[PDB]
Design an enzyme around this catalytic site. Structure first.
Site, PDB file in Angstrom:
ATOM      1  N   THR A 117       1.412   4.491   1.421  1.00 29.24           N
ATOM      2  CA  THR A 117       1.786   5.110   2.664  1.00 29.24           C
ATOM      3  C   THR A 117       2.894   4.112   3.213  1.00 29.24           C
ATOM      4  OG1 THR A 117       0.092   6.593   3.063  1.00 29.24           O
ATOM      5  CG2 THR A 117       1.722   6.247   4.735  1.00 29.24           C
ATOM      6  N   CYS A 118       2.718   2.793   3.302  1.00 26.29           N
ATOM      7  CA  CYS A 118       3.434   1.836   3.902  1.00 26.29           C
ATOM      8  C   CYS A 118       4.621   1.585   3.151  1.00 26.29           C
ATOM      9  CB  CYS A 118       2.624   0.660   4.037  1.00 26.29           C
ATOM     10  SG  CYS A 118       0.876   0.831   5.056  1.00 26.29           S
ATOM     11  N   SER A 119       4.301   1.462   1.801  1.00 22.99           N
ATOM     12  CA  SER A 119       5.672   1.022   0.779  1.00 22.99           C
ATOM     13  C   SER A 119       6.408   2.342   0.191  1.00 22.99           C
ATOM     14  CB  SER A 119       5.087   0.271  -0.536  1.00 22.99           C
ATOM     15  OG  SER A 119       4.176  -0.699  -0.014  1.00 22.99           O
ATOM     16  N   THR A 129       0.754  -1.164   0.030  1.00 23.64           N
ATOM     17  CA  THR A 129      -0.115  -0.097   0.101  1.00 23.64           C
ATOM     18  C   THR A 129       0.798   1.371   0.075  1.00 23.64           C
ATOM     19  OG1 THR A 129      -0.531   0.225   2.283  1.00 23.64           O
ATOM     20  CG2 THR A 129      -1.798  -1.267   1.299  1.00 23.64           C
TER      21      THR A 129
END
Length: 166
Positions: free
Chosen positions: A53-55, A51
């Site tokens: 924001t995560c990646s 995703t």
């Protein structure tokens, strides 16, 4: 509607849990005991592997700041997500984090639920996942805890902020 009876806080011990993880040596099972005991560990949680924001933001920050973090008296770094182990392993490889940091699968949100960190991201196609957070854990005890009010934010729980706490 979520269970807030228990919400993890500074000073709390982490509940026991097991995490599956794809390592270059093969698939392994990581316990909270093995991960945390007698150790100073930086744990961060993400809503989802791959995703944005995560990646693009949250994980790269820890990968970019890994050496600086380890040099400040930290034995290990782990990311945890409510994703299956194959997705976690693929994310380790494609983020370039394989072997640098633990990639822990909390596939059924057992750990996440136990510590009261569930979030509903159904609208984004994610369903039930973990809130974004980071924590400093000392021999299994929560010493610093940074929980994001919004999953699209990653500052308080980011690597740069963690470095300031160490």
């Amino acid at each position: 509607y979520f269970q807030s009876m228990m919400t993890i806080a500074v000073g709390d011990k982490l509940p026991n849990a097991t995490f599956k993880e794809k390592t270059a040596d093969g698939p392994v099972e990581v316990t909270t005991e093995l991960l945390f005991k007698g150790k100073r560990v930086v744990l961060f949680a993400v809503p989802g592997a791959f995703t944005p924001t995560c990646s693009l933001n949250h994980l790269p920050g820890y990968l970019e700041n890994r050496d600086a973090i380890l040099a400040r008296g930290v034995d290990d770094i782990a990311v945890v997500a409510v994703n299956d182990l194959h997705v976690m392993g693929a994310w380790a490889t494609h983020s370039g984090g394989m072997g640098k940091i633990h990639f822990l699968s909390d596939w059924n949100a057992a750990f996440t639920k136990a510590i009261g960190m569930e979030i509903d991201l159904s609208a984004g196609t994610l369903g039930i996942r973990s809130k974004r957070y980071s924590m400093l854990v000392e021999d299994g005890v929560v010493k610093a805890l940074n929980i994001e009010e919004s999953p699209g934010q990653a500052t308080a729980s980011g690597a740069a902020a963690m470095l300031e706490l160490l």
